[PDB]
C-alpha cells in the first residue's frame, strides 16, 4: 500500500508536468489565435491529456485511500481518482470537447451590427456603450443586441453540454455537475454557509439598490422607473448589471466634492496596458512577494492584437506547469476598471508562483475563492484616494463628503456584485440537478435576477432567448460561486492584513502598500496551495477559520449609516414589493 502509493504519486507528478504543459501550450495558442488549425491541434491535445488522465485515474482508483497513512499522499490519490471529463466514453468525450470549443468561440466572436452600418464587438465597443451612454434606447440596443447575438447562439449547444457534463460527473461518483463543482470546497455545509453570508449583506444591498433606483428615477424619468419595483437591467453601466460603478456620475452622494476623471488622467499621463501590469507587479514586490519572471513580459498577451488575429479577450491567468512559464491573456483597456482587473489577474500569477514547488495535483488555491481573492485584496488598497493620488490619478482626502463619495464608488462595485455572484450558480446548480429544464432556462434565470438583484429585463423575453449564454462564464463552463466567496473573504483578508500592517482608524482608509507583515501572511497561505483544507489557510491569514461577512460590513458601515439616513428621508420602500413590474 504505502510504498506503492508514494511511487504512484511521484510517477503521476512527473508525467502530468509534461502532459499538462503541452496541453496548456495548445490551449494558449487557440485562445490567442482563433483559427481552424489551432482548433484542430487543441481538440487533438484534448485526447492526449485524457489518455494520461485515464491511465493514472484508473490506477488511482485501485488504492484504498482511507486506508493510507500519509495525509499529503492520500489527498493526491483521492484527487487523481476524479477523471473529470476523461471519464466519458471516447465518442461522448470528443462531442463534449467540441461543444465546449464551439460555445467559447461563438461567444468570443459574436458581434452586434447596425444594418448597413458598423459592427460592434463586446470588448471594447459594447462595454463602452453600457458604461458611458445615458440614453435609454441606445443602452437597450446594446443590451438586447448582445443577448440576441451571443445568448441565442449558445442555446443550440447548452442542453447537450448539460447532458455530457452531468454524465462525466456521475461517472466520477457525483450526482450531477453542480455536485462535482461544489465539492471543490470540501465543505458539507457550503450551501447553507453561502446563504447565511448572502442574508448578512441584505441590508446593505437593499439600501444601495433603493438609493440607485431613486437616482435612476431622477435621470431616466418617472415613466421608466418604478420606485417600488425592480430596476431595468440595462441602466447600471455594465452589460450584466453585475457592477454599477460606471453610473457613479448619476449617483454621487456629494456632487459638490468632484473627483478626477481617472481614465482621462491615465490617458493624459500616457498609461499603457504594460504600465498597468508593471504597477501591479510593483505592489506585489512592495509586500515582499514575488516578481513575475522576465518570461511573463515576453509571452503574455496584455492587449488586443491588431494583426488580424481573433482572440478570447476575457481576462485570464495561465499556469504552464513548469514552475517558470506564467502568462496573462487580456484585452486590456486603459482605465481604472481594468487596472483593478490587472491586479486580480496578477493575484492568480502570484498564487501560481507561490505554490510552484508542490506536486501538480496540489497546485490550486485553498479553495477556488482564495485564488480569485488575492489580486482583489491588493486592488482594494490601490483603489484608495490616497493611493490613487500617489499614482497621480487623483488630486487628494480627507473630508467626510469625499469619504462617503469614495465608499459609494466602492459599494457600486463590491456590494452590487454580491447578489449577482450568488445568483449565477444557484441557476446552474438547478440546471445541473434537473430542476430547471431547457423549457425554463430563461424564465428561471429572470426569476433569480428578480429575487436576488431586484432587476427586470427592459424588454420582455421570448422563446429562443437564452440570456445566461450572453455571460462569459456560462458558455465557457467556468464555475461562478468562487466570485461570491472571493468578495466576502477579500474583505476579511483586507481587515487582517491591515491589522498586521498596524493600521488604525476606519478600515476603508487602509492601504497595505509596502507592508512586509501583510505580504508574509499572504505568502504563507498561498504556499499551501491545495495541500490542506481551506480553513487552515483562512486561519493563517485572519487568525480564524471561518468565512464571515463582518469585515465587509465593517468596511461599509459608514456608508450603511448614510444610506439609511438618505433613504429614510426620501421615504424609500426597501426591496421591490411590486416585483411583477417591468418597463
Ligand atoms: C507525507 O508525505 C509528504 C510528501 O512526501 C514527498 O512526496 C512523496 C511522494 C515522496 O516522494 C517523499 O519522499 C516526499 O518527501 C511529506 O511532505 C514532505 O515533508 C518534508 C519534510 O517535512 C518536506 O521537506 C522539505 O523540502 C523542501 C524542498 O523540497 C525544503 O524547503 C525543506 O528544506 C529544509 O527544511 C528544514 C526543516 O527541518 C530546514 O532545516 C532547512 O533550512 C530547509 O529549509 C524540507 O526539507 C517536503 O517539502 C514535503 N513534501 C511535500 C511534497 O509536501 C510529509 O513529510 C509526509 N508526512 C508524514 C507524516 O510522514
Ligand atoms: C495563428 O495561427 C495560425 C494557424 O492557422 C498560425 O499559422 C500563425 O502562425 C498564428 N499567428 C501568430 C500571430 O502566431
Ligand atoms: Cl441577462
Ligand atoms: Cl468555484
Ligand atoms: Zn480570477
* Cβ pair 253, 401 in contact under 8 A: yes
**Residue list for the binding site for chloride:** 147, 185, 445, 449, 482
Question: What is the Cα–Cα distance from 409 to 253, expressed in whole angstroms?
Answer: 10
Identify the three-state secondary structure at position 254.
coil
Q: DSSP class of residue 119?
A: E
CA atoms within 13 A of residue 492's CA, in its CB half-sphere: 24
Question: What is the Cα–Cα distance from 501 to 495, expressed in whole angstroms?
Answer: 10
| Burial class of residue 554 in the structure, from the number of CB atoms within 10 Å of its CB (0-12 exposed, 13-18 middle, 19+ buried) | middle
CA nearest 292: which of 324, 333, 329, 322? 324
265: Cβ contacts below 8 Å, ≥ 6 apart: 392, 393, 394
- Strand 231-232 versus strand 455-456 pairing type: parallel
Cis peptide leading into 124, omega within 30 of 0? yes
Looking from the CA of residue 10, the nearest atom of ligand 1 is: 9
| Burial class of residue 324 in the structure, from the number of CB atoms within 10 Å of its CB (0-12 exposed, 13-18 middle, 19+ buried) | exposed
Residue 210 burial (CB count, 10 A): 22
**Residue list for the binding site for Zn(2+):** 344, 348, 372
DSSP 373-428: HHHHHHHHHHTSHHHHHHTTSS-----HHHHHHHHHHHHHHHHHHHHHHHHHHHHH
Question: What is the Cα–Cα distance from 223 to 266, expressed in whole angstroms?
Answer: 38
Residue 68 burial (CB count, 10 A): 17
- The best mutation among 69, 72, 354, 527 to test binding of ligand 1, ranked by most ligand atoms within 8 Å of the C-beta, falls on 72
| For ligand 2, atom 8: residue with the closest CA | 33
* Cβ pair 23, 49 in contact under 8 A: yes
Identify the three-state secondary structure at position 114.
coil
Whole-number Å distance, alpha carbon 70 to ligand 1 midpoint, is 12
CA atoms within 13 A of residue 230's CA, in its CB half-sphere: 22
CB of 72 closer than 6 angstroms to any ligand 1 atom: yes
CA nearest 242: which of 574, 473, 428? 473
Please state the domain extents for the chain: 1-583
- The best mutation among 29, 30, 38 to test binding of ligand 2, ranked by most ligand atoms within 8 Å of the C-beta, falls on 38
| For ligand 1, atom 28: residue with the closest CA | 357
Q: DSSP class of residue 469?
A: G
Residue 459 burial (CB count, 10 A): 16
CB of 33 closer than 6 angstroms to any ligand 2 atom: yes
Taking the CA of 342 as reference, the closest ligand is 5
* Cβ pair 102, 157 in contact under 8 A: yes
Whole-number Å distance, alpha carbon 126 to ligand 2 midpoint, is 27
Question: Which residues sit opposite 329 in a β-bridge?
Answer: 301, 316
DSSP 39-96: HHHHHHHHHHHHHHHHHHHHHHTTS-GGG-S-HHHHHHHHHHT--GGGGS-HHHHHHH
Looking from the CA of residue 362, the nearest atom of ligand 1 is: 52
Q: Which residues of 40-51 are buried (b: 16+ CB within 10 A; e: fewer)?
A: ebbbebbeebbe
Model resolution, angstroms: 2.0
Give CB contacts under 8 A, 24+ apart, made by 516-523: 516/287, 516/288, 518/287, 519/286, 519/287, 519/288, 519/289, 520/288, 521/496, 521/497, 522/287, 522/289, 522/374, 522/377, 522/493, 522/497, 523/288, 523/289, 523/354
Question: What is the Cα–Cα distance from 544 to 539, expressed in whole angstroms?
Answer: 4
Question: What is the Cα–Cα distance from 294 to 152, expressed in whole angstroms?
Answer: 42
CB of 67 closer than 6 angstroms to any ligand 2 atom: no
What's the CA dihedral at 203, 209, 215, 217 to 10 degrees?
-120
Angle between helices 481-500 and 516-527 (to 10 degrees): 140
284: Cβ contacts below 8 Å, ≥ 6 apart: 290, 291, 346, 350, 378
| Burial class of residue 443 in the structure, from the number of CB atoms within 10 Å of its CB (0-12 exposed, 13-18 middle, 19+ buried) | exposed
Identify the three-state secondary structure at position 328.
strand
- Which residues does a chain break follow in the chain (C to N more than 2.5 Å)? 396
Taking the CA of 307 as reference, the closest ligand is 2
Main-chain dihedrals φ then ψ at residue 328, nearest 5 degrees: -110, 140
Q: Which residues are catalytic?
A: 345, 473
66: Cβ contacts below 8 Å, ≥ 6 apart: 74
* Cβ pair 445, 453 in contact under 8 A: no
Identify the three-state secondary structure at position 332.
coil
Question: What is the Cα–Cα distance from 69 to 295, expressed in whole angstroms?
Answer: 40
Question: What is the Cα–Cα distance from 275 to 260, expressed in whole angstroms?
Answer: 20
* Cβ pair 541, 309 in contact under 8 A: no
Amino acid at each position: 500500500d504505502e510504498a506503492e502509493a508514494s511511487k504512484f504519486v511521484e510517477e503521476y507528478d512527473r508525467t502530468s508536468q509534461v502532459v499538462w504543459n503541452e496541453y496548456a501550450e495548445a490551449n494558449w495558442n487557440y485562445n490567442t489565435n482563433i483559427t481552424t488549425e489551432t482548433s484542430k491541434i487543441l481538440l487533438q491535445k484534448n485526447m492526449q491529456i485524457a489518455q494520461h488522465t485515464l491511465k493514472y485515474g484508473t490506477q488511482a482508483r485501485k488504492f484504498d485511500v482511507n486506508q493510507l497513512q500519509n495525509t499529503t499522499i492520500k489527498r493526491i490519490i483521492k484527487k487523481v481518482q476524479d477523471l473529470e471529463r476523461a471519464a466519458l466514453p471516447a465518442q461522448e468525450l470528443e462531442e463534449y470537447n467540441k461543444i465546449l470549443l464551439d460555445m467559447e468561440t461563438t461567444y468570443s466572436v459574436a458581434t452586434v451590427c447596425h444594418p448597413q452600418g458598423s459592427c460592434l464587438q463586446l470588448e471594447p465597443d459594447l462595454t463602452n456603450v453600457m458604461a458611458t451612454s445615458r440614453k435609454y434606447e441606445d443602452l437597450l440596443w446594446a443590451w438586447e443586441g448582445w443577448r440576441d447575438k451571443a445568448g441565442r447562439a449558445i442555446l443550440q449547444f447548452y442542453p447537450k453540454y448539460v447532458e455530457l457534463i452531468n454524465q462525466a460527473a456521475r461517472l466520477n461518483g457525483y450526482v450531477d455537475a453542480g455536485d462535482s463543482w461544489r465539492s471543490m470546497y470540501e465543505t458539507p455545509s457550503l450551501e447553507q454557509d453561502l446563504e447565511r453570508l448572502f442574508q448578512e449583506l441584505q441590508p446593505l444591498y437593499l439600501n444601495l439598490h433603493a438609493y440607485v433606483r431613486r437616482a435612476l428615477h431622477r435621470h431616466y424619468g418617472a415613466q421608466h422607473i418604478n420606485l417600488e419595483g425592480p430596476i431595468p437591467a440595462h441602466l447600471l453601466g455594465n452589460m450584466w448589471a453585475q457592477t454599477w460603478s460606471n453610473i457613479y456620475d448619476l449617483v454621487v452622494p456629494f456632487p459638490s466634492a468632484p473627483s478626477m476623471d481617472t481614465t482621462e488622467a491615465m490617458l493624459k499621463q500616457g498609461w499603457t496596458p504594460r504600465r498597468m501590469f508593471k504597477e501591479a507587479d510593483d505592489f506585489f514586490t512592495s509586500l515582499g512577494l514575488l516578481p513575475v519572471p522576465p518570461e511573463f513580459w515576453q509571452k503574455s498577451m496584455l492587449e488586443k492584437p491588431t494583426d488580424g488575429r481573433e482572440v478570447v479577450c476575457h481576462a485570464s491567468a495561465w499556469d504552464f506547469y513548469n514552475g517558470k512559464d506564467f502568462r496573462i491573456k487580456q484585452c486590456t483597456t486603459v482605465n481604472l476598471e481594468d487596472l483593478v482587473v490587472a491586479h486580480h489577474e496578477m493575484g492568480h500569477i502570484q498564487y501560481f508562483m507561490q505554490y510552484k514547488d508542490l506536486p501538480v495535483a496540489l497546485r490550486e488555491g485553498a479553495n477556488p475563492g482564495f485564488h480569485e481573492a488575492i489580486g482583489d485584496v491588493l486592488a482594494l488598497s490601490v483603489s484608495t484616494p490616497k493611493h490613487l493620488h500617489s499614482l497621480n490619478l487623483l488630486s487628494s482626502g480627507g473630508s467626510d463628503e469625499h469619504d462617503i463619495n469614495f465608499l459609494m464608488k466602492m459599494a457600486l462595485d463590491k456590494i452590487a456584485f454580491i447578489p449577482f455572484s450568488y445568483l449565477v450558480d444557484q441557476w446552474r446548480w438547478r440546471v445541473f440537478d434537473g430542476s430547471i429544464t431547457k423549457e425554463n432556462y430563461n424564465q428561471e434565470w429572470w426569476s433569480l435576477r428578480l429575487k436576488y438583484q431586484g432587476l427586470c429585463p427592459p424588454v420582455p423575453r421570448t422563446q429562443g432567448d437564452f440570456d445566461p449564454g450572453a455571460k462569459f462564464h456560462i458558455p465557457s463552463s467556468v464555475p461562478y460561486i468562487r466570485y461570491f466567496v472571493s468578495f466576502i473573504i477579500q474583505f476579511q483578508f483586507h481587515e487582517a492584513l491591515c491589522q498586521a500592517a498596524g493600521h488604525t482608524g476606519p478600515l476603508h482608509k487602509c492601504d497595505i502598500y509596502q507592508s512586509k507583515e501583510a505580504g508574509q501572511r499572504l505568502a504563507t497561505a498561498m504556499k499551501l496551495g491545495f495541500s490542506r483544507p481551506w480553513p487552515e489557510a483562512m486561519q493563517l491569514i485572519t487568525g480564524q477559520p471561518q468565512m464571515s461577512a463582518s469585515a465587509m460590513l465593517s468596511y461599509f458601515k459608514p456608508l450603511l449609516d448614510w444610506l439609511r439616513t438618505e433613504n429614510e428621508l426620501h421615504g424609500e420602500k426597501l426591496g421591490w414589493p411590486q416585483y411583477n413590474w417591468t418597463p
